[PDB]
Amino acid sequence: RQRFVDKNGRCNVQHGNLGSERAETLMFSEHAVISMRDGKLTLMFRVGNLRNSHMVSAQIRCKLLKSRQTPEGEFLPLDQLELDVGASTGADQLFLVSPLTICHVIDAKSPFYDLSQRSMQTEQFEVVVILEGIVETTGMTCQARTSYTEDEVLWGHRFFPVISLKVDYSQFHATFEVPTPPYSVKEQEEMLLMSSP
C-alpha cells in the first residue's frame, strides 16, 4: 500500500493524540507479559518513545535484579543477571518506527527458565530495562529506564495491537488474557524428555 518508511528515511506512521501529558508515559508499557509467541514462552513488554526527546533508533538491554544464594552459600542481596533480548541477532538495536514488542525468549540460558505460573506467586524479582537512543533533533545520547517487579509481569497475557494504516497510542499499555500453559519452560522440556517414545 504505502511505505512505513520513505526513501528519504522519513517515517510515515502518525501517532494518535497524546493528551496534554508532558510526562514520559509512552516510552515503556506499564506491565510486562509472558505467553506464547512463535512457539516459545516469551517474556514481553512494549517500547514506545519519549514525547520531548523523540528517538530514531536505540539499543536496549535488560537485567534481572534478585537476591540469590550461591552454591557456596553466599547471599547476594541484589544480583544482576542478563536477560537476552536479542544481542546475538541484532534484535536489541531498535528501529523506533512505532511501538515495539521486546521479546525475551525463555530458554535454558534465561533466568526465567524455571519460572512458572505458580512459582510466580512466591518469586521476588525485578526486570530492569535500559534504553539508550538517538534523539532525532540532534543525535546526542539519552537513556530511559524502567522496572517490572513480579506483580507487573502478567502470566498468560498478550498486548493489544496499536497499529493501523496509524498508532493507537491509547492501547499502548493494554493487555488481554490468552490460553497459556501454566508450567515453566524447564518443566515443559522435562515433560518432553518424559513423553518421548
Chart the SSEs and their pairings.
Blueprint: E1 32-37, E2 40-47, E3 55-69, E4 75-83, E5 93-95, E6 100-105, E7 126-135, E8 141-149, E9 153-155, E10 157-159, E11 175-177, H1 185-194
Parallel strand pairs: 1-9
Antiparallel strand pairs: 1-2, 2-6, 3-4, 3-5, 3-7, 7-8, 10-11
CA distance, first residue to last residue:
49 Å
Strand content: 35-45%
Class by SSE composition: mainly beta
Give Rg in angstroms. Answer: 18 Å
The CATH superfamily is identified as G protein-activated inward rectifier potassium channel 1
CATH class group: Mainly Beta
**Architecture, according to CATH?**
Sandwich
Describe the biggest sheet? Answer: 5 strands, antiparallel
Question: How many extended strands?
Answer: 11
Percent helix range: under 10%
PDB class: transport protein
Keywords: inward-rectifier K(+) channel, transport protein
Assembly: monomeric
Entry title: Crystal structure of the F255A mutant Kir3.1 cytoplasmic pore domain
